[PDB]
Amino acid sequence: SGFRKMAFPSGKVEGCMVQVICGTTTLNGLWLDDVVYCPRHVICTSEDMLNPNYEDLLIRKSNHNFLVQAGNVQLRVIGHSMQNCVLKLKVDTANPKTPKYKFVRIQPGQTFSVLACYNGSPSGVYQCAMRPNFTIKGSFLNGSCGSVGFNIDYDCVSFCYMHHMELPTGVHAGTDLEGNFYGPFVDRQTAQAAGTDTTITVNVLAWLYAAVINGDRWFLNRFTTTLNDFNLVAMKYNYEPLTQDHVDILGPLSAQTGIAVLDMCASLKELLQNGMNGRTILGSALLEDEFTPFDVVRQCSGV
Amino acid sequence: SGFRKMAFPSGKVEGCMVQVICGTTTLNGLWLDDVVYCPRHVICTSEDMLNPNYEDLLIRKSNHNFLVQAGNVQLRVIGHSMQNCVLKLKVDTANPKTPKYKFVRIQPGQTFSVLACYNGSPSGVYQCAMRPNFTIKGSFLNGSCGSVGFNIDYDCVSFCYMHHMELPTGVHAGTDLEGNFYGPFVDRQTAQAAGTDTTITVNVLAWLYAAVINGDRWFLNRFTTTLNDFNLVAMKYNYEPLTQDHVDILGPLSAQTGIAVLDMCASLKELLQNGMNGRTILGSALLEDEFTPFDVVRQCSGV
């Protein structure tokens, strides 16, 4: 027992991280088979980022202008292409450590592990979620660009995120591995405001199920509610509206605990209206929304 | 910017995890060079755990009674020895993936990464701390025994923890890699009470420094205090007493922020006496004590 914000083991992704240098700019790339993926603003200086024309800046770059280094082994760049906001650097060596992988574009509210890297070397791993406003609340310092987010199923790494930007508010924006940004953000150093950071209701409920499984039960009450009645309260507290698809996703946790989804909603409603009264749930004094239903199942069964 | 509970990259330790089976019991082992380390209660059944005599139970076990499997490669056991509460299984193959490593016995309040494993396969990684009462608040289900905790410096893995027990209160106890338990705990299924879970004061202060560096400043006040005056408040709130060694360890964070250690203590004092008033610090509604001063420096400089 016990419940922890847990990332996926990072070793499969460590074996894919490389350093990419273009002129004066150094960031991280992801080396899968014979392609290195990295943010296209590797070709920019800080002055360029105010108003970049990437197609024009790219004309001045040749294969030899991109230096790629996997620890100490230097990779020879034999072709390069821009796909949306990523550069694909074709190299002469297939990565021997390439795991089974997929590129997936996740939905808001889904979670994933980030391997924070600098200069091509991993520094740490942590779990976060794609917020409903399409930011993530990460830990990224200068040079972390090109660090990736991923999920793992058995032996297959699903890459879902590559870090590109820190907004002036300190939250983070990036792309999928096809180079499309999540949300409205762009790779330019301009004013970009996020949008309302709403809470991921279905994740809060899953975490409340996790709490029950682990013995934290004080928040269970005698009331129930309805989908429409709960959502009226959800709207007031900037919570995402809960749908029947969400109720269904919560089915297995409902079954294991014998607590109807709607009864748990009534516990959360009371928690939103009355606060925690200085108590904690699973060691937190606020409602946690970075565990999906699948995350809770995975950790509570030891997948 | 941004600040996250971050674990070390786990790949160096994934390459060392093996499955150990003795009769009907399966747990995890750690394969370094030609030795597999695992909890000695691999030789016990659940009935044995009520009152085990390990020396007597071990007489009935021969080299061939221990099955060791690294993914799919079966390791041949050629010798075995009990060292305190661990078994050292000598095998015929040195682990090709053995990293540079050390065995270290950490102090209370120090943090480390846990690679949770089941049946020899990693399931996740998270950061925790050795509590002052020598428990850890982990996430361990049946069969996670033998999962290890570690720190990494450049290329050297310092192993500091191996999981052995879940106490009836749901917290966790284990050994260093020499098989000595942290704290008074023993590998027997009996009543074992932890002790007062005090808060790691020096870690709270470091995290407050982290908060300032990242723009969370509302808790800074106009007061100061003294070591003795603060500690009077620390005692009341079951906080560890703060020493001059702790003030010194906080020196670099004091220097970077220009906030004297004692002024930060006065902010924490006000926070303990008045609560957070429903505010958050770095996304937490309670005072976080699982970041050491070194953790904060590492993450704020991108080591």
Curated annotation (Swiss-Prot), chains A, B:
Changing Q189A: Does not affect ability to cleave and inactivate human TRMT1. The active site is at H41 (for 3cl-pro activity), C145 (for 3cl-pro activity). Residues 1-303 form the Peptidase C30 domain. It comes from the Viruses. The chain holds residues 3264 to 3566 of 4405 of the full protein. There is a cross-link at K5, K90 (Glycyl lysine isopeptide (Lys-Gly) (interchain with G-Cter in ubiquitin)). Inhibited by pyridone-containing alpha-ketoamides compounds 13a and 13b. In turn, alpha-ketoamide 13b (tert-butyl (1-((S)-1-(((S)-4-(benzylamino)-3,4-dioxo-1-((S)-2-oxopyrrolidin-3-yl)butan-2-yl)amino)-3-cyclopropyl-1-oxopropan-2-yl)-2-oxo-1,2-dihydropyridin-3-yl)carbamate) inhibits SARS-CoV-2 replication in human lung cells. Inhibited ex vivo by michael acceptor inhibitor N3. Inhibited ex vivo by compound 11a and 11b. Changing N142A: Does not affect ability to cleave and inactivate human TRMT1. It comes from Severe acute respiratory syndrome coronavirus 2. 3CL-PRO exists as monomer and homodimer. Only the homodimer shows catalytic activity. Interacts with host FBXO22; this interaction promotes the proteasomal degradation of nsp5. It catalyses: TSAVLQ-|-SGFRK-NH2 and SGVTFQ-|-GKFKK the two peptides corresponding to the two self-cleavage sites of the SARS 3C-like proteinase are the two most reactive peptide substrates. The enzyme exhibits a strong preference for substrates containing Gln at P1 position and Leu at P2 position. Cleaves the C-terminus of replicase polyprotein at 11 sites. Recognizes substrates containing the core sequence [ILMVF]-Q-|-[SGACN]. Cleaves and inactivates human TRMT1, preventing tRNA guanine(26)-dimethylation of tRNAs. May cleave human NLRP1 in lung epithelial cells, thereby activating the NLRP1 inflammasome pathway. May cleave human GSDMD, triggering alternative GSDME-mediated epithelial cell death upon activation of the NLRP1 inflammasome, which may enhance the release interleukins 1B, 6, 16 and 18. Also able to bind an ADP-ribose-1''-phosphate (ADRP). Signal peptide: none annotated. This is 3C-like proteinase nsp5. It is found in: Host cytoplasm; Host Golgi apparatus; Host nucleus. Residues 1-303 are cytoplasmic.
